[PDB]
Ligand binder design. Structure first.
Ligand SMILES: [Mg+2]
Lengths: 623, 1316
RNA sequence: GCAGAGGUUCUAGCUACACCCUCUAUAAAAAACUAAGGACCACACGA
DNA sequence: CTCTGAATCTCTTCCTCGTGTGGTCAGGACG
DNA sequence: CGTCCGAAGAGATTCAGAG
């Protein structure tokens, strides 16, 4: 076939070489693959799993149980019994899946949470069922996405899978303290629809005894889901030394927000469920629940919030339609003004007043201005146009439009992704990156011209090729990051080093990109921080900066905090726990031993697929 | 007027733009190309002819022996397409080639020959393509995709930027030939023109001029402008021309004819040039310091001694000036150097170049080409002449010469294939001009530089390779051959040419295994335009530029249908209207625009000449006079969209569907959904599995009929007539009298292909679409093939779809499917499996196929017959036994675990010599019976047709109705008929029938021998048994279901119908999609498709309501007319009064299942039209209705969107994907999972997953699954014994892969060991 | 049940990952049972 | 005249897993 | 029955400018 024939060095180097093909990562037994299914009824500690897959993977366990119970005298007869799929075999199978975790594994395991443990729930079917919450952690779709399942065999393997790899044990991503099992796409939309208000809705005004009465009114259908009604709640706070005190008050709210109150655990305050509850609000809610209640209450609350979000999104019927995306009435006049302006610029260029470069710049600027104007008109038509009364004359409220609810909530969408539907799609660039002079004025609700779609597919092909190259580049970067690492583990607990890095909020000419509260959180200081009062030990030398310490830092108005950096650690062949800081996945100091080089490499390399490829000084505020 | 099948169900077609050009035959790119290759071309251009003529000199060395091609003719194929597919043999035509061998006398080259030997020799075995434009190679329907590669010619690239890491732009020119050696002329960063031939070491390109028999004086005369210097008494008066002063600096004080024009420090203004031209100055005095900066042009010697005073091309100094002045060189030639534009580049190379003679140049070229050995002058000359001046070892096609002359701005179009001195110097001059600034570099991605190599061109190239390979052997043999001692058949053998052609057609970088699962898949895979391939850029070597779409792709290559992944934009498909030029370039239909009128004349335009004219947009309104109603029309002049006046416009797009391909045109509302979603929808349409009962899409594009007819899936009617007899396996068409030939017309018989195994294990089922007596016109559809309904491409099956979240079962992209869908078998697809059993030769005796299998039960053997082969029609299950084969001392073929189904047929092939078993005899007997029955059926049918032909003629001029019934129908030549042309016609029919009767038994015997002869098989096999299993895979949770708009999802739960959201009418929605996928992934077309499908089903429901109750046909007619009019004017314009008033009932019954609506690609239904269509029925104009919860029973607030959108079912079923494994056979390296596939395997716990476990505190599960679960043999055995014992304890051991690595590193010669 | 052979079945069955009994040079009263091989290159497709 | 920096040339990859196919040293006759 | 014949960067390697 006229091809270079593999040598004694072609099988020790390269992707197909023995190292990276058979030693670094090797194929394994007790493994199966199938497409994945949502199955919302599951809890994140468990996953669905087909009967055939549990029968094939756990064949040695079934044989052992059959021998122990004497159903089959020999392995050979037991193997025949497994082939016959006799009913007794299924009952035996249910015994070996009671507390036997399996490692769900998606193919592009970018980061640590790519593979997680689950208690398999035997389902009839052929598709693995993956809990909806962990899909964001897996970055897994339901569009033919397949993930392998591995069966831990030894007591050590199953036990450590249960203790570490369980989705219950993976709530905070290793990259950052923010939760990773946050309500992502549909449950967040259901919660957002739940926590809103009409200025005039059915059953608005009457006082409610509690969340139970709110559920009674909503289910009976005599009160709207989101109507501004005063309710009485027993809000629990742990301001005492771990004891939870009860505060009862009549907080003005809606029925929908009162529904969620029975879901949240006792410790959480009511101020967290009294907003519109978008994606960011739910993320902050889950983070506060994790930092206050702990882990198990957070898991139970996440499961319950997923259940209610799905149920009330189904009850919402948040559809999508042509009338749901509105064309601004001022879009036509904005387009006319832009055409007049470009005609004037072209006429000026024809005379010779403006040459090609300045004409191109002027046309680009005026088209961008028209695009911004039409985007603002679209937002006004999509969130302000809604007119609804209050049993009076006239009032204006935030819109309940389907697309506005599905975009503003952060459920799925963004500013450009909503602009490309009703407003002007905008100036679309050529392959080389230089902007087409004339934009794609027509939006997706209306039709597109053939040239407009040609520019659109120019951009789309550019993006697809960019993604295809970028995923490979990010994989190479992740490999390099992992391999410069993997010799760095937390070998000690402390070093007594006063060295470190002075953590300061970063300013790049603009506002505060990252406050010091979110920049030093979870790290152990190197020297005592002091407030404006000098010789004040506000925070001692070697205390981890958890949420309470960081909150104290903000109210004391600290500026720069010296912190123990892993670079400054003098430990040999590893680093000490204090010089590293919080695990970023558990609310405590890093365990003595845990590999942080690979964690860091995966955290850095995971967003590689999400990256891209290509006077005077004025004071801002008083000070 | 409308075709009769169109009258059955006429598609409501939108689109205000009237079509001018009908859609071309989509398979033209393959059929026309091959028809050019296998055709006998008397002109000897483009075909097996050129290939024979190009390689038929056969000149013996001092032997006076010559062989020449005279004619050739492809033989009739040995086996038909169906026969070759079932046998596994290629569909090939024996290549009967006629050759003439002539021998001349010794030492008499001009004398006549002494003997002439003409005979037909079989050389080669060329496969043929079927009527569907697809080859059959080894029982597999394999298609060759056309390759889009950089055309031969000259291209001046830049490689701007990165080179030299200084911002200095380089320029290079590549002489890329069709076949031969590349020739690149590059620039050194110091502005030295180098040559780089075949990407070898860079060489001073002036050496090629010396290699072309050119000296320094000639080189400088060609590439530089001579400046004449005259020695005069007034300090060497200098001759200057006005043109050379443009753009110059103040070199000196220009004073001529006693007048000052330009002084020191004064720029030469064009006014100064004009005034000196008016003065007409020719001689201008120059200081002696200026000549120091000039360079001499030609050599000079003194007239006294002749010694070399000064050679050519070196700087001039004061001593050189004194020497030339004292010698008396009155005329001095100097080069014109202008650092602004006309800079010196050849001179610098000549300074670098140390070669001064042609022989030295040839020696250096030989050294840089073939180093390590001492070159020879004769050897170097032979190498150079065979490298550039020889046709056999170097050639540019006519397209290459055309591109060469286009880039060089020559006048002639054609020319010699090989290059010449003029070509090289012209290329160098153009490269120099590009460096200067005049002219522009070209774009590689331009479709004017990337031609298309079709299947015919590739086959011709491989045939030329085979001919030259056999020509070398013929020349070698003829050197020692003897005259009149051999037949002109021994020197040429079919073996090497046949091997080359078969290797190209079977195993190639481009011989794609056709994905024959959809008519759309077939039609878009035969039109696929791949950049990858032989003589083409590879995926890794492909740049970002090539993958990414060019502005010239408009109308030539679809910018929406490309495969995402490793090769995005490299395998782009060809647009619907584009056709390949005669030179391989891509043309595009374009309506000529007259003074102001858009004329109907269609002018195909290539990519190079598209820029010269200005192209109007298809979506430009016209006033029926060709006048744009639109004083400024958007246009595409130079690839830039820009408004133009009507009078400026030179051309207009042929239609609105031009840019998109057939795969992307079928998506309705393509102008609405995003380009990425459109890409994914077009890609997924190519992989939809045919449903059991395919049905027309309620909303479509109108090209489904065109795609179905153009593709070979359906049985189109070659001749019109009436359906005399229709059957599920055959259709008989009685040709009309005005559509049949006078002789050998008869009637048409169509044998529809029944359930047949396809390339992707799907059923190619053809069901009749007509009944008895139904009139059929020419070119009409008769059999609904796979994924076809009423002649319309029906890929999936449309159904009610409600866009609303449902308890998370459609969480992010998953699809929820009702129990009603599964119940009515909407997505049950028949899958045909090919389980083939082979009985190879074995040591210590062969193996038998009998039913005697040891250690098995009688229940398993019950299905098998007495001879050990499964009974046809038996319903076997997973793990069952099909054919009993026992090896000599239990290797019987068994059904794979999990898969089930019923056997449809069992074909057995047995080699001649070994006696066939009982089942083989029974199958052969049944095959003979079926062949005889079919032959007798066609006998009786054609005899009835011919008698009807005779009886119709015999109604006048000697008609005897009673006499005909008296004598038997066998004999009619004794009848008395008038001696006229009718009698001659009857005599001709009688003679033809007699010859047919003589040939009937001959062809029956031929068929009997075909079914009796032992089929050719692989060496060392006894007999091969193929068992075809038909699997009916129903829709299941996990099956990948996807619409046409890029919305893809796995079915999560088969929700019972009682739980489905039902409207006020009570009809439950069949599928509950997720609205959240619409805004982010802007597939807004599916919402338009959903609303239009809702309107279509509303019309269908109104028709059903007025049809279930007995209503007058007038109401149906008026409602149908109202539906087809629909307000805004459309091209459809169908009138219901012209119908027969009883086919209106048939039309209404065909519209009961829903109104068929066509939405063209870019001028489809507007929002107003859809709103009016909803208003036509009882459905609300908003498009979304209130739905009540299936379980709770109370209506959802915020009424949800429902409609009948056409969503497919992809062949990525969950049944295929299940791969669970505990223990199995292991690999070479002892990695147990054995590369998991059909072979029972475990999934690769790759390096990323190992890192993921490392990030966790995992050291026991990782260790177990990288050691005791994968390759530790002792570890694996101990772990298995422990788990079956019940103690899940790991005996670690060591991976055997590490021992393999140690042995491999040791084998290199590097001791790697372990310390104890 | 660890080195071999025999037994009622079905050529052969001694733990071969492997299923019952006997003993250290001898073959049968006895039902559930049996088999331990298998690479690379290209294409297309999915995520 | 011997190193300095700089151009030139050569090496070394350039994601990560699946699922369908198809093609692959090819000794060959003689003691 | 067997037996002998693009691309992107890094580093080594020339290779060169200046006293
Ligand atoms: Mg996905």
């Amino acid at each position: 076939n006229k091809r270079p024939l593999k040598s004694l060095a072609d099988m020790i180097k390269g992707k197909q070489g023995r190292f990276r093909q058979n030693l670094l990562g090797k194929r394994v037994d007790y493994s199966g693959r199938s497409v994945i299914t949502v199955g919302p009824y599951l809890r994140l500690h468990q996953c669905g799993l087909p009967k055939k897959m549990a029968l094939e993977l756990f064949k040695p366990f079934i044989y052992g149980k059959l021998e122990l119970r004497g159903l089959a005298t020999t392995i050979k007869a037991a193997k025949k019994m497994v082939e016959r799929e006799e009913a007794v075999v299924w009952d035996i199978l249910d015994e070996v899946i009671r507390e036997h975790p399996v490692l769900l594994n998606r193919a592009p395991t970018l980061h640590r949470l790519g593979i997680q443990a689950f208690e398999p729930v035997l389902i009839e079917g052929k598709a693995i069922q993956l809990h909806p919450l962990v899909c964001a952690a897996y970055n897994a779709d339901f569009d033919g996405d397949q993930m392998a399942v591995h069966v831990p065999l030894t007591l050590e393997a199953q036990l450590e899978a249960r203790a570490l790899m369980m989705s219950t044990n993976n709530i905070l991503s290793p990259a950052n303290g923010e939760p990773i099992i946050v309500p992502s796409q549909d449950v967040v939309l259901g919660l957002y629809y739940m926590t809103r208000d009409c200025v005039n809705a059915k059953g608005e005004g009457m006082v409610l005894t509690g969340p139970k009465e709110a559920e009674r009114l909503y289910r009976s259908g005599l009160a709207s889901l989101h109507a501004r009604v005063k309710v009485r709640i027993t809000e629990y706070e742990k301001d005492a030394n771990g004891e939870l005190v009860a505060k009862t008050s009549l907080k003005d709210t809606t029925v929908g927000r009162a529904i969620l109150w029975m879901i949240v655990p006792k410790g959480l305050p009511y101020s967290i469920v009294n907003q519109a509850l978008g994606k960011k609000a739910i993320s902050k809610m889950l983070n506060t629940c994790y930092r206050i209640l702990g882990l198990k209450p957070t898991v139970i609350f996440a499961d319950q919030i997923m259940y209610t979000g799905f149920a009330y999104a189904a009850r919402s019927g948040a559809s999508v339609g042509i009338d749901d995306m509105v064309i601004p009435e001022k879009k036509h006049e904005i387009i006319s003004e832009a055409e007049a302006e470009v005609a004037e610029i072209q006429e000026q260029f024809q005379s010779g007043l403006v040459t090609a470069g300045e004409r191109y710049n002027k046309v680009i600027d005026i088209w961008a201005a028209a695009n911004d104007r039409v985007s603002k008109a679209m937002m006004d038509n999509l969130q302000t146009e809604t007119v609804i009364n209050r049993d009076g004359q006239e009032e204006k409220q935030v819109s309940f439009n389907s697309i506005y609810m599905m975009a503003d909530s952060g459920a799925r969408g963004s500013a450009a992704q909503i602009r490309q539907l009703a407003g002007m799609r905008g100036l679309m660039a050529k392959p080389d990156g230089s902007i087409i002079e004339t934009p794609i004025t027509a939006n997706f609700r209306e039709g597109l011209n053939v040239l407009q779609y040609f520019i659109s597919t120019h951009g789309a092909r550019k993006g697809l090729a960019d993604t295809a190259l970028k995923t490979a580049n990010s994989g190479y970067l992740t490999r390099r990051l992992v391999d410069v690492a993997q010799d760095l583990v937390v070998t000690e607990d402390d070093c007594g080093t006063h060295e470190g890095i002075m953590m300061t909020p970063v300013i790049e000419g603009g506002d505060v990109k990252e406050p010091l509260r979110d920049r030093v959180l979870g790290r152990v200081t190197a020297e005592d921080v002091l407030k404006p009062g000098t010789a004040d030990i506000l925070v001692p030398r070697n205390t981890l900066l958890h949420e309470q310490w960081c909150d104290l830092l903000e109210e004391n108005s600290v500026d720069a905090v010296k912190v123990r950096s892993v670079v400054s650690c003098d430990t040999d062949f590893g680093v000490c726990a204090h010089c590293y800081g919080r695990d970023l996945a558990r609310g405590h100091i890093i365990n003595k031993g845990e590999a942080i080089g690979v964690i860091a490499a995966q955290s850095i390399g995971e967003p590689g697929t999400q990256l891209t490829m290509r006077s005077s000084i004025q004071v801002k505020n008083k000070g | 007027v409308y075709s009769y099948t169109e009258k059955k169900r006429i598609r409501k077609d939108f689109g205000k733009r009237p079509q001018v050009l009908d859609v071309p035959y989509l398979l033209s790119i393959q059929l026309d190309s091959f028809q050019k290759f296998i055709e006998q071309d008397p002109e000897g251009q483009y075909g097996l002819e050129a290939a024979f003529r190009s390689v038929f000199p056969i000149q013996s060395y001092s032997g006076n022996s010559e062989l020449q091609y005279v004619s050739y003719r492809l033989g009739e194929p040995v086996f038909d397409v169906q026969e070759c597919q079932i046998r596994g043999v290629t569909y090939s035509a024996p290549l009967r080639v006629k050759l003439r061998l002539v021998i001349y006398e010794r030492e008499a080259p001009e004398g006549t020959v002494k003997d002439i030997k003409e005979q037909e020799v079989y050389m080669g075995e060329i496969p043929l393509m079927t009527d569907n434009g697809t080859f059959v190679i080894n029982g597999t329907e394999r298609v060759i995709v056309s390759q889009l590669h950089r055309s031969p010619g000259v291209f001046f690239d830049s490689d701007k930027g990165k080179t030299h890491s200084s911002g200095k732009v380089l320029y290079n020119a590549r002489i890329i030939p069709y076949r031969g050696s590349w020739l690149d002329f590059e620039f050194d960063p110091k502005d030295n023109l180098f040559v780089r031939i075949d990407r070898r070491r860079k060489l001073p390109a002036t050496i090629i001029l010396r290699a072309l028999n050119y000296t320094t004086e000639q080189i400088l005369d060609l590439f530089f402008e001579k400046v004449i210097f005259e020695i005069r008494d007034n300090k060497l008066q200098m001759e200057l021309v006005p043109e050379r002063l443009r753009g110059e600096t103040a070199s000196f004080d220009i004073e001529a004819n006693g007048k000052v024009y330009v002084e020191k420090g004064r720029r030469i203004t064009a006014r100064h040039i004009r005034q000196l031209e008016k003065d007409d100055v020719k001689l201008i005095e120059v200081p002696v310091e200026y000549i120091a900066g000039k360079v001499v042009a030609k050599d000079y010697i003194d007239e006294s001694t002749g010694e070399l005073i000064c050679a050519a091309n070196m700087e001039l100094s004061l001593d050189l000036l004194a020497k030339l002045s004292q010698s008396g060189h009155k005329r001095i030639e100097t080069l014109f150097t202008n650092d602004l534009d006309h800079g010196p580049y050849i001179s610098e190379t000549l300074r670098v170049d140390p070669t001064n003679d042609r022989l030295s140049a040839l020696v250096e070229i030989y050294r840089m080409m073939r180093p390590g050995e001492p070159p020879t002058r004769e050897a170097a000359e032979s190498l150079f002449e065979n490298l550039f001046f020889s046709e056999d070892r170097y050639d540019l096609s006519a397209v290459g010469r055309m591109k060469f002359n286009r880039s060089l701005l020559r006048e002639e179009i054609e020319g010699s294939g090989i290059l010449s001195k003029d070509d090289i110097i012209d290329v160098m001059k153009k490269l120099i001009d590009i460096r200067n600034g005049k002219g522009e570099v070209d774009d590689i991605d331009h479709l004017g530089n990337r031609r298309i190599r079709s299947v015919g061109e590739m086959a011709e190239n491989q045939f030329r390779v085979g001919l030259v390979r056999v020509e070398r052997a013929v020349k070698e043999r003829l050197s020692l051959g003897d005259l009149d001692t051999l037949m002109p058949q021994d020197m040429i053998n079919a073996k090497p040419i046949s091997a080359a052609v078969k290797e190209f057609f079977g195993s190639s970088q481009l011989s794609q295994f056709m994905d024959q699962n959809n008519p759309l898949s077939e039609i878009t895979h035969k039109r696929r335009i791949s950049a990858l391939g032989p003589g083409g850029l590879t995926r890794e070597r492909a740049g970002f530029e090539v993958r990414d779409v060019h502005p010239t792709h408009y109308g030539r290559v679809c910018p929406i249908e490309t495969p995402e992944g490793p090769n995005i934009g490299l395998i782009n498909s060809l647009s619907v209207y584009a056709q390949t030029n005669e030179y391989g370039f891509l043309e595009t239909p374009y309506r000529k625009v007259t003074d102001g009128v858009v004329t109907d004349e269609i002018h195909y335009l290539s990519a190079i000449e598209e820029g010269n004219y200005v192209i109007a947009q298809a979506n430009s309104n016209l006033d029926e006079e060709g006048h744009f109603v639109e004083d400024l029309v958007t246009c595409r002049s130079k690839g830039e969209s820009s408004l133009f006046s009507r009078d400026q416009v030179d051309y207009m797009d042929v239609s609105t569907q031009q840019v998109v391909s057939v795969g992307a045109s079928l998506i309705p509302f393509l102008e609405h959904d995003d380009a990425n979603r459109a890409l994914m929808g077009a890609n997924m349409q190519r992989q939809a599995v045919p449903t059991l009962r395919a049905d027309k899409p309620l909303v479509g594009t109108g090209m489904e009929r065109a795609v179905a007819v153009d593709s070979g899936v359906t049985a189109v009617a070659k001749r019109g007539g009436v359906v005399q007899y229709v059957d599920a396996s055959r259709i008989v068409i009685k040709v009309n009298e005005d559509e049949m030939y006078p002789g050998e017309a008869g009637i048409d018989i169509y044998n529809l292909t029944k359930y047949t195994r396809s390339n992707q294990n799907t059923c190619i089922n053809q069901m009749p679409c007509v009944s008895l007596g139904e009139p059929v016109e020419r070119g009409d559809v008769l059999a609904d093939g796979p994924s076809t309904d009423l002649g319309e491409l029906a890929l999936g099956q449309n159904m009610r779809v409600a866009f609303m979240p449902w308890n998370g079962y459609n969480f992010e992209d998953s699809i929820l499917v009702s129990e009603r869908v599964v119940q009515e078998d909407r997505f049950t697809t028949i899958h045909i499996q090919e389980l083939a059993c082979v009985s190879r030769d074995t040591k210590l005796g062969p193996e038998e196929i009998t039913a005697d299998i040891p250690n098995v039960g009688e229940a398993a053997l019950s299905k098998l017959d007495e001879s050990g082969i499964v009974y046809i029609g038996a319903e076997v299950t997973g793990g069952d036994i099909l054919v009993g084969k026992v090896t000599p001392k239990d290797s019987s073929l068994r059904v794979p675990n999990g898969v089930s189904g019923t056997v449809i047929d069992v074909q057995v092939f047995t080699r001649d010599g070994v006696e066939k078993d009982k089942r083989a005899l029974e199958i052969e007997e049944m095959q003979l019976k079926q062949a005889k029955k079919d032959l007798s059926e066609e006998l009786q049918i054609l005899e009835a047709g011919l008698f009807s032909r005779i009886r119709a003629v015999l109604v006048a001029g000697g008609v005897e109705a009673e006499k005909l019934d008296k004598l038997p129908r066998d004999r009619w030549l004794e009848l008395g008929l008038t001696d006229e042309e009718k009698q001659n016609q009857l005599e001709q029919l009688a003679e033809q029938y007699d010859e047919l009767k003589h040939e009937f038994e001959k062809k029956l015997e031929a068929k009997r021998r075909k079914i009796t002869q032992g089929d050719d098989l692989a060496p060392g096999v006894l007999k091969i048994v193929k068992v075809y299993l038909a699997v009916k895979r129903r829709i299941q949770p996990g099956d990948k279901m996807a619409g046409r708009h890029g919305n893809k999802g796995v079915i999560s739960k088969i929700n019972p119908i009682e739980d489905m959201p039902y409207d006020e009418n009570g009809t439950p929605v069949d599928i509950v999609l997720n609205p959240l996928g619409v805004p982010s992934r802007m597939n807004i077309g599916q919402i338009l498709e959903t609303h239009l499908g809702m309107a279509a089903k509303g019309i269908g429901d109104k028709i059903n309501a007025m049809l279930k109750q007995q209503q007058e046909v007038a109401k149906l007619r008026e409602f149908i007319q109202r539906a087809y009019d629909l307000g805004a004017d459309v091209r459809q314009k169908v009138d219901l009064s012209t119908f027969s008033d009883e086919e209106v009932m048939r039309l209404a019954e065909n519209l009961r299942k829903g109104m068929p609506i066509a939405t063209p690609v870019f001028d489809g239904a507007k929002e107003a039209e859809i709103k009016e269509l909803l208003k036509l029925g009882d459905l609300p104009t908003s498009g979304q209705i209130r739905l009540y919860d299936g379980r709770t029973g109370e209506q959802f607030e915020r009424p949800v969107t429902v409609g009948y959108m056409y969503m497919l079912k992809l062949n990525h079923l969950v049944d295929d994907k299940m791969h669970a494994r505990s223990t199995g056979s292991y690999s070479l390296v002892t990695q147990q999972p054995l590369g998991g596939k059909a072979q029972f395997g475990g999934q690769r716990f790759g390096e990323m997953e190992v890192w993921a476990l490392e990030a966790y505190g995992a050291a026991y599960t990782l260790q177990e699954m990288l050691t005791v679960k994968s390759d530790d043999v002792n570890g694996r055995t101990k772990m298995y014994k422990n788990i079956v014992d019940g103690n899940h304890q790991m005996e670690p051991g060591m991976p055997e892969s590490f021992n393999v690595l140690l042995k491999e590193i040791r084998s290199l010669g590097i001791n790697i060991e372990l310390e104890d």
